[PDB]
Point group: C4
Chain length 395, copies 4
């Protein structure tokens, strides 16, 4: 008589058949049919149906059935409630906004985070420490990347570019640094040559950004060597262009840091928080423009309409330079190259400081907390090494 | 015999009729009446009343009945407990302070966040991307707003105001920038004219701050054009005033950013955190005044009562300038235009730095966390698109 | 037979009499006695004892009885668990460290936050807005405090102290500012005189820090007026001392801000977080000393043992000045008056920057979070105005 | 018939014997054996097994049995769930990543935080305040450490090193400071001598870093005294070396601060967050290198290939100095000694500022939150003094 008792894991839940039918197409709606006594596990003597599930969360699922809103309990995790909803046939997109984010947190974080000697030669990058030879190769690669970066940094130092007035007063970098860069080049191009020759999935290897970086890093030395024969003025200009391009040597440390879990988590966080990064950029641009205009106008209060001497006493000659001042003041960087010198400009700068603090504190915590989730999940996955399931599902 | 059993969703709750009557005027108080056996769903054989509700939270409601204090469970959400309290007749303002904020969080966040061709022409701003023509119009508006802002920023640059000594050594802005601003004006005033002519709810349209901004942005060009005919000295002064007013061009980017969810969430957060903003302002003012006075006095320790040379060795000539120093030091901005040069002033500046850090870290986290709630709720509402209810309430 | 059933709010809990006796002196230990059948509410037919309490938390209390450790459920609040423990006779100091802080949070926050016309005249400060006359008096007091502060700030400005060379080239402040300070004095001393004459609890009134501040603020004007008659050189020195003491005028704004809930919450937070403030001070001192010594030594690498020219190229002449540099660099203030100019000093300064960031981020979040608790509780108490209890305890 | 009822603390849990056998080797798997009726507490009349445990968490353990995933309820603490899992034979390493971190938090924090007169003389450092004589000794040690640090700081001040041109224009520190350092030395070496003579566990005492620091602090004075007799030029060089080593006096304040709970918690946090510190270091190095290169190239846009005058207008002569600029800009320190002066360098500096803010805000919150856990746990352990257990385990 409209009375149905559901025994979920030893706990008897009593509700109405109309309440069960309120959500058609689900297991509890099917149970509310006159044929459930034969279509389900039914007890004639006890006059109740049995279910080997978790009653505590069945209570909340039946609360959805009863009221019309699907919430999520805070005493169990999202994955557990998801398994129970899947078993009961409840659509997980019915979760109310008051619980959706907490319910999805873990799944969202997981989504964000996720010849016979030819294989041996291709194993040079895969777990280099696994083999002694590959570990030694990795150590040599670290040496020859650090040395290349050091040579690139030193080539710009004035000590290594004494001015030669014989050939014409121009500068000339020392040749020993070039020789060290050359030995770096020969070793690193040996590695690149073996990687390119012994290369499965050629399309993927070419598309690989790290390999592209390696190729564009090795190109300039060869191009400079070849073009030196031409020894033309246009060849000199192209040599200058090649020197400009030589900066790609610093990008070979991303290969070294590619195995770092913190770096991978940071990359995943950057991919996930694109909206927050765009929000930060837009906020910063708005504040920069507004405060540059405000300081420009506050530093000219009481000035003549067109007198050129109005701008002779203020660092803020124009609004574009106020942009730089505003970004520096908003980031609390405060270089001091430009600062207000009037009372009105002083008030404007104070407002700029507080506004920058607040507008940067708006989305940076969101990005930081996303990074926290992803880092914690990665560390947990490390601390939980793969092992036997220990559980046998039913035949 | 004073013993009453309430069967809430299959779970039997046993309490005393005096306990039920402790809260008069509620459903459980009515149940505690001699006529509940006919006024409610009663089972003579089982001698208990049945309720198709959530027992887990009925336990806490009955705990309110039993002890006298209404708390809120942490295993269910505020909206769920609110529905249950509403059904049971419990006043939601009885929630104790230890649980009120958590119970209300979601509702507070939601409150904070909340001719035949004439409609087609009025659809120019409503979902411009919806129609191809309106999307093109929006692209053109973006172009003509960015170009206007660029021209306004460039007019203040010294490169575009060569000094003319013929007519009288004064500055004169280039005319090509004025011409580009003029084409910007003609397009934007075409848009404004159509918006004003085809305008439902004229009162609302006039009261609209964005439309007011548009009108005050278009006024100065027309006023300068008209007043140039007068060519009087007072007309020149009014032209200078119009140049000052010309700054309202930068306010036309708020129209572009008005569709941004981050901007709307920021606005809602600013509306909600007025108390925290006032607290921040008052704290900053107190600290600024106190530390300006303290540094003024610390830089004059051991000085003569009236010797004018006492202030010749310190940046802190007066307390008003100490205000600027104190705000700069409190925000950790540290421009460096003024800094203590004595030991006592050094100690005072250190105290200013720490005090500013703490007093700014007091309410900024509150504002940030409010922003976090509102942003998370808005993102959840986006991720949860409107769909079928999927639930049928009882006839 | 060692089997006892406890019916707590309709839920039957079955345990052993030895388990109940494991904690002597409590209600459940008494229940485990052969005389509980007459000393408690017992049901012979059902063979169980009845209790009109919350079973969900009785389960955790019985878990304490069973295992030996008292924990606190996260599905209910600390006050609720406290009431239940008090009823069951459990000592609340048995709570394990894994739950003690969460259990106590709310109570700790509450502890931190906590003639016939003679009363009318004494009501001048109590809710001044309550009476129209008192509100007008408060407005006048605000006016005469702001004006006094403005006069005090302006007296130090060079515009108001033109140098008089007739009487002897010394400075002399303008007399109109003194006259305005005098009218401020007469009004404020009228208020102070009425407060002192009509004064209940004279001991408390004298001990009041705000009234002490008022008296020390009014003293210097009278002392300067009286001592001007002496017109002696020692009198001039005492006049200079009185000018130094005149700074106490800025302390009369604490009276205005004493009614501010944010200010009161800040005071409570300062009282509560004394340990964290001491930790911050000690950390800062350690880092300052260490980094001052480190930078002093890093700026003298390769220098002569005693050559005086070693310190001619570095801002770090000594360690005491390195203290100032270190505090400025640790607070991320970066004035720029002193900075490393060597590679070793540069590394030391970088280490100082990161170390300061971390050591300041250590306890500042603790203080901030305490402030957050207290502010949230105060706002909740405001949002929950006093009303009828609505609940009637049993006779 | 495949139906088994488990009565856990008065609550009847009904499941299948196959469900119980899904996890072999556990208590519930043993219960699912035909001999459980004699191997466990069984009730023939009621046909159920009894367990004096917590049903609420038994429900989640049986949910593990049922589904195959072990989660952890959020309504109870990690230690409680750990005791229950241990009783039921469940491996605590089966906890899913969605709950592992919350389940382990407390245990991880605890792991991170963890003659007859000869003993009396050795009690000089153990609870010095316990005995009056030891408290006086501690006060004297504080005096003689602070005075030594003050003398060390003052010896580098130019006031105490007047230049002597008689003996040869070199500097000479005052002798009274040396005499005060000598009395400091005699007292502190008395303490060290008694500590070394009366010393249990000599190996541990020698290995103690604080005692090593004490010995290396006392060595230089004796070495300078002894070597002064030689009075050789090489002896003068070794005297300069000893002056350099004299810096170890500042390390004697770690002994004073070794009893501070905040310092111990900081040390534990540093030990625990090694991964986060390495992440911070690697992030900072990557950003510093990248932004130094970027600013170097942005300040030379449009410059000649080799013209020496290209670097005459920019602070960024090389990339190594850009390293210093980049670290200063990333930490928001902003000294101002070097800043971009071009538009491209300005954009690069802005990007550096935001990138530094974000990359420093990534792991610093993790370290801060670890510190928060450890500090809260230490304060809780203090607030919970050792007392009687009050609970008697079963014979
Ligand atoms: C509590 C009640 C406080 C009451 C005190 C406020 C009233 C006294 C203000 C000082 C009035 C004065 O005479 O000083 C003005 C001086 C002298 O300069 P001037 O007379 O204004 O002439 C113009 C010269 N300029 C400034 C353009 C370069 O110009 C100056 O340069 C003075 C510098 C200080 C001006 C204010 C700037 C402060 C900015 C930070 C404020 C932080 C606010 C936190 C909230
Ligand atoms: C641990 C125990 C530490 C024990 C060391 C403290 C005792 C030694 C202090 C130095 C005493 C000294 O002789 O130096 C004084 C120098 C020389 O100047 P003067 O002799 O004082 O004459 C006055 C000139 N003024 C300063 C007004 C421009 O004046 C100076 O300019 C020195 C600058 C340093 C003065 C202290 C300022 C430091 C401010 C930051 C402190 C951070 C505290 C964190 C907690
Ligand atoms: C990745 C691999 C990176 C490999 C690059 C490191 C190796 C190259 C270092 C540069 C070596 C060099 O020749 O430059 C030295 C210059 C010239 O000066 P000097 O030859 O050393 O003579 C002494 C003059 N001083 C410095 C005392 C004023 O002295 C200078 O002033 C140069 C300034 C830069 C020195 C380093 C300071 C940087 C501090 C910030 C570091 C942040 C680290 C984050 C982690
Ligand atoms: C909203 C729409 C905004 C539209 C405005 C952008 C278009 C106007 C840009 C200004 C164009 C201009 O004519 O100014 C250039 C001036 C003059 O210098 P120059 O003509 O470029 O010659 C080279 C000299 N240098 C710069 C190398 C020393 O060079 C300068 O020094 C000007 C300094 C400003 C340059 C930009 C730097 C700003 C950096 C901070 C940006 C923050 C962004 C937050 C997002
Ligand atoms: C420091 C910088 C970031 C500027 C300061 C930020 C806020 C103080 C302002 C700047 C832009 C403002 C927004 C600009 C325009 C709009 C659209 C406005 O909606 C409309 O105008 C639609 C029509 C109407 O009903 O008026 C709602 C507020 C909002 C989001 C504003 C909220 C407040 C904002 C974020
Ligand atoms: C850096 C700036 C913000 C100043 C430093 C802030 C705090 C160290 C001080 C400044 C003002 C102080 C408040 C000024 C006056 C009062 C009113 C006082 O109450 C009374 O005086 C009422 C009568 C009495 O019982 O004395 C309680 C403390 C409180 C809030 C003080 C708490 C401590 C405060 C916040
Ligand atoms: C930037 C400033 C704050 C200095 C850097 C802080 C930490 C890197 C150091 C400085 C002082 C150190 C503490 C100084 C001395 C001790 C006592 C030491 O215990 C003993 O020496 C007792 C006897 C023994 O077993 O050795 C335990 C570590 C601890 C707290 C140290 C932990 C690491 C600390 C906090
Ligand atoms: C301001 C500094 C810290 C530089 C900016 C940081 C991020 C914008 C960049 C710098 C280094 C990047 C990482 C460098 C290389 C890799 C390895 C890459 O994996 C591979 O290349 C493996 C082969 C392939 O499938 O391509 C995955 C992304 C990741 C972690 C990158 C993610 C994005 C990172 C963190
Ligand atoms: C060339 C004329 C020269 N003489 C003169 O008083 N002014 C002036 C006047 C008011 C004024 O308001 C201010 C003040 C601060 C910020 C600010 C404004 C704006 C222009 C209205 C918008 O942003 N600014 C400048 C001048 O610019
Ligand atoms: C013109 C006389 C001149 N000669 C002289 O010693 N002083 C002096 C003395 C003490 C002194 O205390 C200090 C120090 C630091 C901060 C501070 C104070 C106040 C005045 C009491 C309040 O805020 N300040 C200054 C002077 O101002
Ligand atoms: C007067 C002699 C002069 N010539 C010379 O090389 N030095 C020197 C040598 C090493 C040195 O180590 C450094 C470097 C950086 C920081 C630092 C140290 C300490 C002294 C060991 C402790 O803190 N410092 C200075 C000098 O001070
Ligand atoms: C000596 C030649 C001189 N003349 C000239 O235009 N350039 C130049 C050109 C482009 C350029 O791109 C930039 C700009 C900003 C950052 C940046 C780059 C890199 C080199 C490509 C990598 O990091 N930088 C510099 C010069 O360095
Ligand atoms: K800063
Ligand atoms: K700064
Ligand atoms: K700075
Ligand atoms: K900061
Ligand atoms: K500076
Ligand atoms: K600076
Ligand atoms: Zn919900
Ligand atoms: Zn509560
Ligand atoms: Zn616990
Ligand atoms: Zn889980």
């Amino acid at each position: 008589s409209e009375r149905i008792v559901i025994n979920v894991g030893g706990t008897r839940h009593q509700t109405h058949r109309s309440t069960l039918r309120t959500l058609p197409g689900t297991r509890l709606a099917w149970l509310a049919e006159p044929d459930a006594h034969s279509h389900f596990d039914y007890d004639p003597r006890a006059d109740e149906f049995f279910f080997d599930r978790h009653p505590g969360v069945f209570a909340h699922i039946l609360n959805y059935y009863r009221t019309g809103k699907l919430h999520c309990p805070a005493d169990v995790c999202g994955p557990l409630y998801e398994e129970e909803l899947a078993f009961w046939g409840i659509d997980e997109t019915d979760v109310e906004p008051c619980c959706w984010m907490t319910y999805r947190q873990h799944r969202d974080a997981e989504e964000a985070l996720d010849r016979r000697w030819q294989p041996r030669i291709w194993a040079l990058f895969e777990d280099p420490y696994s083999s002694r030879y590959a570990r030694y190769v990795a150590f040599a690669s670290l040496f020859f990347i650090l040395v290349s970066i050091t040579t690139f940094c030193l080539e710009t130092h004035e000590r290594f570019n004494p001015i030669v007035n014989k050939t014409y007063r121009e500068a000339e970098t020392e040749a020993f640094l070039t020789y060290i860069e050359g030995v770096c080049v020969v070793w690193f191009t040996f590695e690149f040559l073996m990687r390119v020759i012994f290369c499965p999935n050629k399309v993927e290897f070419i598309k690989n950004s790290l390999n592209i970086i390696d190729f564009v890093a090795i190109l300039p030395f060869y191009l400079e060597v070849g073009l030196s024969g031409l020894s033309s003025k246009a060849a000199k200009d192209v040599l200058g262009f090649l020197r400009v391009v030589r900066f790609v040597r610093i990008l070979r440390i991303f290969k070294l840091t590619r195995h770092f879990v913190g770096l991978r988590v940071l990359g995943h966080t950057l991919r996930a928080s694109t909206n927050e990064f765009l929000l930060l950029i837009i906020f910063l641009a708005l504040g920069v423009l507004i405060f540059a205009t405000m300081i420009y106008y506050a530093e000219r209060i009481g000035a003549q309409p067109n007198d050129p001497s109005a701008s002779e006493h203020t660092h803020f000659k124009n609004i574009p330079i106020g942009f730089w001042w505003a970004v520096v003041t908003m980031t609390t960087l405060g270089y001091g190259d430009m600062y207000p010198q009037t009372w009105s400009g002083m008030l404007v700068g104070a407002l700029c400081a507080l506004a920058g603090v607040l507008t940067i504190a708006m989305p940076v915590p969101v990005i930081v907390n996303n990074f926290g989730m992803y880092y914690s999940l990665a560390m947990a996955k490390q601390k939980l090494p793969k092992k036997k399931k220990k559980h046998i599902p039913r035949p």
